[PDB]
């Protein structure tokens, strides 16, 4: 009953609508993030999901108290009765504050008036991605947040600890399938708007895409299609149906592979690294088809070799047997050295 009396005194005359220190000082809000699980990064929508314990701490002299306990730990129902920062994510997109079983938010009021207001959020924040280097790309996905109604002269945000140590990611929270969270770097800036200047806390999560999935899904099938185009070189020239089926198969297969590569990506007007890889692979297979046509022009005799004249093995085929694997290997070395070595 004593604690109920204290809470009644705290809310007696309290004005939910006015920030702490209105007309006296700026309201400094020290903010922290404990990423419970870095949720899946949706490249198609250029957004990422992150599950966080978003903590906020600010001093409110109205909520100063003296009692048997130094820290009143309270449920979410008290939070709605007090002023809390109107924080929002500048790049947020359809976040959710979890409700099960109860509203997942804690409040702790220290006897000096300091508040600790934490909430469990699943935030789908926008991450603009420049996919030129995709799939070897690295992305500094931001999470900008700040007040909506309060300008820098009204509410200022701060990190509760050192900026390096104020965003902690759990060891087992990595829900990334095709990404590796290298780390996070934080900063604080100012944004100019039609309504005023707003303090914006930015934290960039540095993600490096894991190329293994695309190695198995795209690069290996493309390489195998190229090699399937080159077995046609090794085959004899007279088997026109055989090599025709081979080359047409390889070209159509590379067509469907190219389309399967694009639909896995968000739409963009520029070509990614895999688009260039597929373009050169398509050039190789189409060159194999053109090579087959070239040798087919000089196929004087339609009948195949038997153990009567006989066709000689095509010179173009013999040079191709070495050139195509050498050009393709040199291209692979150049490509992988160009992108892998990059920072």
């Amino acid at each position, epitope marked *: 009953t004593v604690f109920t009396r204290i809470l009644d005194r705290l809310l007696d005359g309290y004005d939910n609508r006015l920030r702490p220190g209105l007309g006296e000082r700026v309201t*400094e809000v020290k903010t922290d993030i404990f990423v419970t699980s870095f949720g899946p990064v949706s490249d198609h929508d250029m957004e990422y999901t992150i599950d966080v314990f978003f903590r906020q701490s600010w*001093k409110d002299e109205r909520l100063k108290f003296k009692g048997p306990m130094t820290v009143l730990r309270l449920n979410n129902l008290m939070a709605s009765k007090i002023w809390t920062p109107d924080t929002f994510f500048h790049n947020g997109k359809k976040s959710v504050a979890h409700n099960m079983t109860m509203p997942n938010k804690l409040l702790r009021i220290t006897e*000096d008036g*300091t508040l600790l207001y934490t909430m469990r959020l699943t935030v789908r924040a926008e991450c603009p991605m420049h996919l030129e280097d995709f799939p070897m790309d690295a992305h500094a996905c931001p999470l900008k947040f700040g007040s909506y109604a309060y300008t820098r002269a009204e509410v200022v945000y*701060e*990190w509760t600890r*050192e*900026p*390096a*140590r104020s965003v902690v990611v759990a060891e087992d929270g990595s829900r990334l399938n095709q990404y590796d969270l290298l780390g996070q*770097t*934080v*900063d*604080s*800036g100012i944004v100019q708007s039609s309504t005023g200047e707003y303090v914006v806390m930015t934290t960039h999560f540095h993600l490096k895409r894991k190329i293994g999935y695309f190695v198995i899904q795209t690069y290996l099938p493309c390489i195998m299609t190229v090699i399937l185009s080159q077995v046609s070189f090794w085959l004899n020239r007279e088997s026109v149906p055989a090599r025709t089926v081979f080359g047409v198969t390889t070209v159509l297969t590379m067509t469907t592979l190219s389309i399967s590569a694009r639909n896995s990506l968000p739409k963009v007007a520029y070509a990614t690294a895999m688009d260039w890889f597929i373009a050169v692979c398509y050039a190789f297979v189409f060159s194999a088809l053109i090579e087959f046509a070239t040798v087919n022009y000089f196929t004087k005799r339609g009948y195949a070799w038997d153990g009567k004249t006989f066709n000689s093995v095509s010179k173009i085929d013999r040079l191709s047997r070495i050139a195509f694997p050498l050009l393709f290997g040199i291209f692979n070395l150049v490509y992988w050295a160009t992108y892998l070595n990059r920072e």
Partner: antibody
Amino acid sequence: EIQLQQSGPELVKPGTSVKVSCKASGYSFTDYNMYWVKQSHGKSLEWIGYIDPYNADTTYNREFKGKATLTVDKSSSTAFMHLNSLTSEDSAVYYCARKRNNFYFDYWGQGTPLTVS
Amino acid sequence: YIVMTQSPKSMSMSLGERVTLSCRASEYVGSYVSWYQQKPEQSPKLLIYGASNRYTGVPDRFAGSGSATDFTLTITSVQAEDLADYHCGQTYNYPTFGGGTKLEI
């Protein structure tokens, strides 16, 4: 006008401990962390550790870990640094700094020359 | 910790001339870099908090800017009172101040 008042210079021989105080008056002591820095003669400033006055949570430098003990007095509103196992290398000038936020140290102490020989 | 390096350990600038300093950080420190002024036998005095912002009560001539790692402080014109040692410190991680630069005549 915030003014961090440190103690005067100390004379001491090696192998004994010293206590250097830092008194703040303008601002309320508990609101902001207190940092201790030492600048060896003609060298760069060197951070030794900081203490959150409200709950006395303290963090030290790895180089100075275990050599300096930081404490606070709410009633006296004063931060104390206790140096143990003094050596000739310790000779330097200490300051206490006030961290307004994670952008700058707003005020600094006058400086307490430590002499050991 | 983070290592802060100042390239021109000592330079002489004619009175009234523009003088520019430099401060380097080992790795990312964001905008969390401050510039302080230490006159002989005096405590440091804050000049430029953050990458660009200037502390209250400081002459307008002081002004600095920097990227994530490199930083610079520029004085529009040196004055007799401006002769002192200039430090650069960072607060992105635990504090670690730089070597410091000294100006003469």
